Swiss-Prot record, chain A:
The modification N6-acetyllysine is found at K232. Component of the small ribosomal subunit. The ribosome is a large ribonucleoprotein complex responsible for the synthesis of proteins in the cell. Part of the small subunit (SSU) processome, first precursor of the small eukaryotic ribosomal subunit. During the assembly of the SSU processome in the nucleolus, many ribosome biogenesis factors, an RNA chaperone and ribosomal proteins associate with the nascent pre-rRNA and work in concert to generate RNA folding, modifications, rearrangements and cleavage as well as targeted degradation of pre-ribosomal RNA by the RNA exosome. InterPro entries: KOW, Rib_uL2_dom2, Ribosomal_eS4, Ribosomal_eS4_C, Ribosomal_eS4_central_region, Ribosomal_eS4_central_sf, Ribosomal_eS4_KOW, Ribosomal_eS4_N. Coiled coil: none annotated. Pfam families: 40S_S4_C, KOW, Ribosomal_S4e, RS4NT. One of its GO terms (biological process) is cytoplasmic translation. It comes from Mus musculus. This is Small ribosomal subunit protein eS4. One of its GO terms (molecular function) is structural constituent of ribosome. Keywords: Acetylation, Cytoplasm, Isopeptide bond, Nucleus, Ribonucleoprotein, Ribosomal protein, RNA-binding, rRNA-binding, Ubl conjugation.
Swiss-Prot record, chain B:
It comes from the Eukaryota. Its main location: cytoplasm. The modification N-acetylalanine is found at A1. This is Small ribosomal subunit protein uS17. Citrullinated by PADI4. Component of the small ribosomal subunit. Part of the small subunit (SSU) processome, composed of more than 70 proteins and the RNA chaperone small nucleolar RNA (snoRNA) U3. It comes from Mus musculus (Mouse). The modification Phosphoserine is found at S66, S109.
Amino acid sequence: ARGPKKHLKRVAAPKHWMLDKLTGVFAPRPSTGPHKLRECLPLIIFLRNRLKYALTGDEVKKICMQRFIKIDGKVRTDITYPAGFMDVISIDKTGENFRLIYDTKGRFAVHRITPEEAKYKLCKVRKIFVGTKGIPHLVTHDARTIRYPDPLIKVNDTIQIDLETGKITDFIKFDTGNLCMVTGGANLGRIGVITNRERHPGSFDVVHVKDANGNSFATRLSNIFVIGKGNKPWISLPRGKGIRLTIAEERDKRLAAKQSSG
Amino acid sequence: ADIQTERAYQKQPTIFQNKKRVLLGETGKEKLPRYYKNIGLGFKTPKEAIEGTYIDKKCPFTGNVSIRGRILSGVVTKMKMQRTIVIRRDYLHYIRKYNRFEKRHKNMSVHLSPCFRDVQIGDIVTVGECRPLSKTVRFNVLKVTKAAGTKKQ
RNA sequence: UCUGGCAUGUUGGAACAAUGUAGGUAAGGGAAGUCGGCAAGCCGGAUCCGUAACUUCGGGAUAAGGAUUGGCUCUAAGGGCUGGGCGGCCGGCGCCUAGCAGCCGACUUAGAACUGGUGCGGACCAGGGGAAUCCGACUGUUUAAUUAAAACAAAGCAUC
RNA sequence: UACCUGGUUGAUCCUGCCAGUAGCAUAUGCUUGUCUCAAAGAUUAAGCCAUGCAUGUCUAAGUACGCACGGCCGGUACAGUGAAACUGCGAAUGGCUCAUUAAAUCAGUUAUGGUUCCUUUGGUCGCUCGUACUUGGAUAACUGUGGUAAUUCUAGAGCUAAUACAUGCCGACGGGCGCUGACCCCCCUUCCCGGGGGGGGAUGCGUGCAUUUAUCAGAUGGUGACUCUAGAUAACCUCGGGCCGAUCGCACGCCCCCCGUGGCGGCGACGACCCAUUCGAACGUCUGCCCUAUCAACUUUCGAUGGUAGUCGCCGUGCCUACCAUGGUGACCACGGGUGACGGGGAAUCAGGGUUCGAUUCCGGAGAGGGAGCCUGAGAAACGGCUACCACAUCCAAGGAAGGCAGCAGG
RNA sequence: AGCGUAUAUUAAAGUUGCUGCAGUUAAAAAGCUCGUAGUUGGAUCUUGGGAGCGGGCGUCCCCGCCCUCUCGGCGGGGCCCGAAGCGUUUACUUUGAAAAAAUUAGAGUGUUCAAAGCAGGCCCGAGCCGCCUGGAUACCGCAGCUAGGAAUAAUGGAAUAGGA
RNA sequence: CCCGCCGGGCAGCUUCCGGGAAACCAAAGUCUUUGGGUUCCGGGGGGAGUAUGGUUGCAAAGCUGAAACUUAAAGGAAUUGA
RNA sequence: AGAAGACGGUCGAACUUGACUAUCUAGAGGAAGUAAAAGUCGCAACAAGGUUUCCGUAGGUGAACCUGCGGAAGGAUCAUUA
């Protein structure tokens, strides 16, 4: 290759992207932004494939320059903008607000939230550097660099940021006993409480997380995402509390629901 | 014993060997400041590395080197070089069809800092991956271990 | 070129025709000449590389093929002698020991910079080469005065 | 569904292979009523291509005096519909083929603390102390002229302009700091009169980020360790010059207070000096390939193995240069060659173990007849860019021009 | 609405034999010895004993039990073991972490069955100004990350004591 | 000299140990109820121990050693006759 | 500001020569291996095949073949008598 590839294929789409195989040889390539494309979602896929508001990619472009779609309080015309983790898309015409988070199946699900909840958010820091004129700054996973942070904030902490203000409201450190959600790997989409953590000087660290149902698991540091303090998340959660149930258990509830409905 | 054998005298960039002097005495009485720094993983800087008078840009302790990527080991066979010891590591590859293995070895060259002096033939040396400082050598010696040694007659 | 020797080899003067004897050069071809490359020409020294078939394993071999070569200014290496705590010496008091100091000396080799109209083994000296066939094994000898050869001899083999 | 039979015989037990026998891919042959999917020039020929096409593009928001239209209406001064062109951006993606390539590409894991990056986003853009209520020029289309056989051919004149090029201002903020510091004020020893200490301070040089440097403190931050991100001490800061708006639209408003026109104003777009993120980009650590000894001792005077000092290289190295004692590799298969070999994710078959096939539409690499080369661009050593050579060959008015369909059809 | 021939290849073929061959006479042991790669290399170092926790730790089958040294770290009494180590280092076994898409094993999905497709199913006086769900798992050889296991395979400790 | 015992042997002879296709053999056994270690060596019959390359030899020749092509049998043991 | 143009520095397409190496190819003539309808000598091996046979070496020969030195049983003889 002579440079940056400018296309994505139908099979080149990430697996958790629910895209059909027999519709086209290409895919809506997510363009550059605050998120790595491998764990983001374009606006077309969020609306056309999931919400069914539009049926063609052209119609998704029609509503975009109609300027009815907003992200983080900002109207973006990019149909392939990377709506990544902790992104809220609010449509004022229908008066609906959605918080983009993972479900129990490791999927970029759509979760309706109240407007008051959408006004604030949650972000995770990545690094601290003393930039210009000897003052600190924070660079996050959302690429929202913040000037003049609280000095008590360290690496791998979670900072609340408002849509309009764009500042630090409430920060929480990284510690045991805190609720967390996995942001990668096999355990993607699970909510649990950090019971243990082990370190390795020269490689990744392992954080052992044990959920409310006792299903313990282990995860890498880069896939740890802190949301709430203790055993209560700061934000609403989708169906299932982010608990991965087994194949046999899931089919048992599925058959019970089918029998009760019928 | 002269530190100045090369075409141009090598200088440690961090230290300042050049200092002013006071009345009734000189700075030459005290030894020059030496810049060194220990590493993690229990890689405690050995005695000869601190108190030695050698200067090396490529040493694990008095240089720019950061050891990362992978931590490995090997044995000592030959030492005919300028600050390089050739090492070889055994490893057994598995063949599925015949449900057995083959003995294999891929020897490499490691650059050894002059601080280590007590290395003989047939002992283990622990080395770690580093920057491509040479065309072939990409490892640096971090630890020296004997193998039925400590008594040579 | 010096020591020593000589007077150009049994004559001189003038001219510079043909033909000749001896020595050279020649555009473009490059053996088309001729019985035949006869004659002439090419190569040629030294240093550094690189050398085939075949073979009696010794050779063939300077095989073949290629590069360098001047002048000037430097650098490095290659040795000999003496000594070891006014004049001596009875002496512990010294310790030459990674061979140190002083003095002496000739011939080369290698490397580098600079430099000339790329010219330099500058004259002199000084192998053209390769692929094959025939004969004789080789070195040697022979018809002084037309035949130097495949002829003769030769070691080896055999016979009487 | 873990399978035989026939075949040496005067007949039988064995060894042993083939013949039949079951699937599997390419085509051939005879026939073929329907529909749902769907492979389809790779095999010898990565051989050559006539012809047609495959990259273009404008919002209220850069530039609009085109006699192509057109509203108000000729007292105004910038309407708009808009060819074409300048300006910025894409053309290095896509798609075809496997010629080439054998620890090499690639497959699993890791790093770039060893580097860079228009693109989207998040910061910053009064941080520096020294004509502005808008600067100079030509160049477009266009008109008027011309050349041949010519093109995606074009010089000379009058014009016009850009978010194109070059230069550049006031504001912006009153001051601090380190030195150099005249001068001025105060305190104490001193029986004397000299010193010992505090302060103001005019007048002078510097005093931001980006970059190059040399020095200091670092029980500001964090990593396990960077010579890290920070703070200062003294200079340069490239005229083949860095940053501090000479840019364009929308709806239009508030104040005359010390004033009949001055200030205050929002929504955006345009590229930045530097930092971060992402798409990425390339060089890297451990582990893995087919046949081959009728390839056994090989690399190294020409860089091969390493050190020191330099050169470029986006950065780290025999990438290159010079000096240093020889070193490295090899029967655990090197060096060499062949391959009817791009690799792998993967395909046929089946007790199990396994044997074969991998261009294919997927993820990476290479190529555009061949290997050379290069300007713009962030990213090319690019071929639907150019140059030269080699075969082939298009037009020629014989003075030249113009070329690569292993892109889609078709030959 | 197919079949044969032609050729490539697999099973057959225990006819390449690791699984899983043969060598007196059917093909075959070198004439023999040495010797290095390489291959394979004997036992031997904590086994039992009443632990009580559960059934038919009693005999027997599945669980931790009567590893250090430093602030007994949420200027000094038991309600503590977070981290600076390892009475040593490999191989193997299990889990866990690392797994670009498709295919394959296979969950559910109908209605022309399936091959295929990830879709569709669900009350309707229709104001029903439409609720819910799927789009999972398994394997991913080898190489490396990690936490245990400590039979099996080799390694050293201290013999002139340069011993803890 | 005779009687034995013990360990290392060259060995018969009988024997339904056993295996083997049998001839015959305590190894030519412990072999599908398949694994003690390992070397050399065979893969239907010919072509062919040939061609070519390499190496040894004074020669004759030795060691290493193919391919093209061609064949449905060549073979071992045993049965009764001649 | 600068077009045309010249000198020096680097790969270098391409060219010449030489060396090494791989593969594919002609060739007068020579000598083998493949099938044969079954053409000419007597008969080497199958019996003790009448000179058991086969193996190597050496040597010779129209040919099978003959000869010597050894070496075996695929020659008719597990035996040959104190």
